[PDB]
Enzyme design. Structure first.
Site, PDB file in Angstrom:
ATOM      1  CD1 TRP A   1      39.760  40.982  42.849  1.00  0.00           C
ATOM      2  CD2 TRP A   1      39.532  41.632  40.718  1.00  0.00           C
ATOM      3  NE1 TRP A   1      41.011  41.302  42.375  1.00  0.00           N
ATOM      4  CE2 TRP A   1      40.892  41.704  41.064  1.00  0.00           C
ATOM      5  CE3 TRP A   1      39.128  41.987  39.423  1.00  0.00           C
ATOM      6  CZ2 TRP A   1      41.876  42.123  40.168  1.00  0.00           C
ATOM      7  CZ3 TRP A   1      40.091  42.403  38.531  1.00  0.00           C
ATOM      8  CH2 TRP A   1      41.436  42.465  38.908  1.00  0.00           C
TER       9      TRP A   1
ATOM     10  CG  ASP B   1      36.419  36.181  39.626  1.00  0.00           C
ATOM     11  OD1 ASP B   1      37.379  35.385  39.486  1.00  0.00           O
ATOM     12  OD2 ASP B   1      36.569  37.424  39.613  1.00  0.00           O
TER      13      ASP B   1
ATOM     14  CE  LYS C   1      45.081  36.752  40.832  1.00  0.00           C
ATOM     15  NZ  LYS C   1      43.784  37.432  40.552  1.00  0.00           N
TER      16      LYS C   1
HETATM   17  C1  LIG Z   1      43.239  38.324  39.670  1.00  0.00           C
HETATM   18  C2  LIG Z   1      41.696  38.419  39.697  1.00  0.00           C
HETATM   19  C3  LIG Z   1      41.033  38.886  38.583  1.00  0.00           C
HETATM   20  C4  LIG Z   1      41.828  39.491  37.417  1.00  0.00           C
HETATM   21  O1  LIG Z   1      42.254  38.505  36.505  1.00  0.00           O
HETATM   22  P1  LIG Z   1      42.931  38.868  35.086  1.00  0.00           P
HETATM   23  O2  LIG Z   1      43.400  37.570  34.577  1.00  0.00           O
HETATM   24  O3  LIG Z   1      43.986  39.829  35.442  1.00  0.00           O
HETATM   25  O4  LIG Z   1      41.800  39.448  34.325  1.00  0.00           O
HETATM   26  C5  LIG Z   1      39.668  38.821  38.526  1.00  0.00           C
HETATM   27  N1  LIG Z   1      38.940  38.373  39.606  1.00  0.00           N
HETATM   28  C6  LIG Z   1      39.597  37.950  40.720  1.00  0.00           C
HETATM   29  C7  LIG Z   1      38.770  37.423  41.898  1.00  0.00           C
HETATM   30  C8  LIG Z   1      40.969  37.979  40.780  1.00  0.00           C
HETATM   31  O5  LIG Z   1      41.608  37.647  41.956  1.00  0.00           O
HETATM   32 CL   LIG Z   2      38.357  41.831  46.060  1.00  0.00          CL
HETATM   33 CL   LIG Z   3      44.113  41.538  43.339  1.00  0.00          CL
END
Ligand SMILES: *Cc1c(COP(=O)(O)O)cnc(C)c1O
Ligand SMILES: [Cl-]
Ligand SMILES: [Cl-]
Ligand SMILES: *Cc1c(COP(=O)(O)O)cnc(C)c1O
Ligand SMILES: [Cl-]
Ligand SMILES: [Cl-]
Ligand SMILES: [Mg+2]
Ligand SMILES: [Mg+2]
Ligand SMILES: [Mg+2]
Ligand SMILES: [Mg+2]
Lengths: 360, 356
Positions: free
Chosen positions: B101, B171, B195
């Site tokens: 990510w 993030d 999440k």
């Molecule tokens: C789930 C996740 C994303 C993706 O998020 P979307 O809403 O699908 O764009 C981005 N960064 C991290 C760390 C994630 O776990």
């Molecule tokens: Cl990751």
């Molecule tokens: Cl993921």
């Protein structure tokens, strides 16, 4: 309890069965013992929903096989910039037909990104009509011609769509998509936030001619390329799963009542109840739109002065009517009568309007 | 009819939040309309919108000089919106790579400007968080970006670096509001809700106001949304309603410190099971970097991996397959995953090991 009549302009009334269906299975969807909101979008239960929403749309509007249906986040407003970002290339022109405030907002975003043009405009006369297609100023280097099918704030609507062969025809159909039959192949792309006539907020339906836009555009952020979403079937990143689910449920309802053709008949009938009330009011109510351009989705009107406007709207709100205040930019009144608004709501509004007039 | 929801995104939500949603789905707040049927300019909606912000402010103790935004497009759109707004010419988008990510965020910045890798544990397949003393920072950094919880690799920042030359940006999609936070360490925090906070469809962005613009599209300017209180265009009203509901549940159980206690017990159940398994289960993360949100592990070979995951599925467990990019297994234990599910997982892990 007391009556509630939902004339909200966006988000707006949903058909009860779509909501009852959602409620009944909210905790246990498709026997998974999970909410659809708790599923992976890679799960087969979710993918079924995602695919069914596409297939219902396809069947209902009869979308050709060379078009793909995207489900995107960001609202119609994000499409105002995504469209010129993908198609407004150097040396080309974003040509716009201005028929209300939403058309101006679309134009403004293209102006940020390239050459724009105004093909025709009714702005001088305060957007009371759709201009004649013969007045359209077209350019050989137009990237597209962009229109607003239903001018949500002003209460006007295209009766039909221009034949355009030099550039793709693009339309913001947020407030009248699937309110009537559509010849989708007149267009290169159609977009609509769902929350006006297709269900919940949070998803935007984008119907796109695949070959116009299934190609990478250099320098455009991955999320802002149509190609990204076409290639990944709107599953590039996590979709708005509950919104798409509710969209599915609403589409099922449209299909269950006979589709676009039957819903048009219903929508013409509801609209007629309100416009006849205006038209028999001897000027007590004055519709904004010229008669040939009257919208079937948003009925805009004023009383003879602002004091009467306010008393009318206050009385409505006391009697259970919701959302009749005109958009803040124009004042007056606005009866939004999208697909799911029931006809007895319209009858109720007529009753309100007649007694208010008689008692004034 | 037993089901254990280890989905990694979208994910389990609190039963009380979903039951509350169900109960009033047709008649919200005595309006006789669904929350879904309300105008976003209605007071009825506006109260929910604000209540969601207020609860986050309370629960994370977000200072007044931060604004809380509710945007569409997922954490993925933030990957480009951030450099679009802050990666000005002559500045550098500096990234700490602690998983895939991280990589995806860095990629979007490379489109828009100069980038840099302050540190990376990629060489070692992201088994750990790098030592902050290792970071390579630049006078002209526009920001330093990190991924607080590396969802695919199962590692997580224990604490955060003290960065004063540029805003720290994170993030936090897979660990936001899973434990107390010192928000003042950051210039911006972002997370898809799906999440720890709510269903998919809304992205929470916590931004130092004064921190964040000629030529950026209106919808892609943070200033647009700050100025309009995330009501510039139609927000995802049902998702924000559900976010409120989830936040009410977190507040009701005692807040960020209380949910951290639950989360640490959940993770302890699985990691102890792994550690006590004598190498039958092997965790991917170095111990010191173990995530409390995504527990990643494999069996001794691919066929046992597969036998385990098949047995899991038959027993009602959902979502345990590892990310396709890495395989193995992944138990996502976000806020609403109950302790009983982790206990069930343990018992399955132990039985499987005994029967192999
Ligand atoms: C789930 C996740 C994303 C993706 O998020 P979307 O809403 O699908 O764009 C981005 N960064 C991290 C760390 C994630 O776990
Ligand atoms: Cl990751
Ligand atoms: Cl993921
Ligand atoms: C509602 C509306 C919009 C705005 O849609 P958002 O999803 O709020 O961005 C754009 N165009 C038209 C014609 C609309 O009626
Ligand atoms: Cl308009
Ligand atoms: Cl509108
Ligand atoms: Mg049917
Ligand atoms: Mg009735
Ligand atoms: Mg409470
Ligand atoms: Mg021990």
């Amino acid at each position: 309890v007391k009556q509630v009549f939902n004339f909200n302009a966006g988000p707006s009334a949903l058909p009860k069965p779509a909501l009852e269906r959602a409620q009944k299975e909210l905790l246990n969807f498709n026997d998974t013992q999970m909410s659809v909101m708790e599923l992976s979008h890679r799960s087969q239960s979710y993918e079924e929903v995602h695919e069914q929403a596409q297939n219902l749309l396809r069947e209902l509007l009869q979308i050709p096989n060379d078009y793909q249906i995207l489900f995107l986040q960001g609202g119609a407003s994000l499409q105002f910039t995504m469209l010129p970002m993908n198609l407004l290339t150097k040396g080309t022109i974003g040509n716009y037909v201005l028929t209300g405030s939403w058309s101006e907002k679309a134009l403004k975003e293209a102006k940020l990104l390239g050459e724009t043009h105004i093909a025709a405009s009714t702005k001088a006369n305060s957007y009371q009509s759709i201009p004649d297609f013969s007045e359209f100023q077209l350019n050989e280097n137009d990237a597209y011609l962009h229109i607003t099918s239903n001018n949500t704030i002003y209460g006007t609507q295209y009766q039909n769509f221009p034949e355009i062969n030099h550039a793709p025809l693009i339309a913001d159909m947020s407030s009248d998509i699937l309110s009537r039959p559509l010849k989708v192949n007149q267009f290169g792309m159609i977009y609509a936030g769902a929350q006006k006539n297709l269900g919940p907020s949070g998803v935007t339906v984008v119907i796109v001619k695949k070959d116009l836009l299934n190609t990478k555009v250099e320098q455009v952020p991955t999320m802002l390329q149509y190609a990204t979403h076409i290639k990944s079937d709107s599953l590039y990143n996590t979709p708005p799963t509950f919104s798409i689910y509710m969209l599915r449920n609403v589409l099922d309802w449209i299909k269950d009542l006979g589709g676009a053709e039957a819903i048009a008949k219903q929508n013409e009938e509801k609209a007629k109840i309100i416009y006849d009330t205006i038209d028999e009011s001897n000027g007590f109510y004055v519709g904004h739109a010229e008669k040939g351009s009257r919208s079937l989705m948003n009925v805009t009107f004023n009383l003879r002065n602002e004091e009467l406007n306010q008393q009318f709207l206050a009385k409505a709100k006391e009697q259970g009517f919701v959302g009749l205040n005109g958009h803040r930019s124009v004042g007056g009144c606005r009866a939004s009568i999208y697909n799911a608004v029931p006809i007895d709501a319209c009858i109720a509004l007529r009753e309100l309007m007649i007694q208010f007039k008689e008692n004034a």
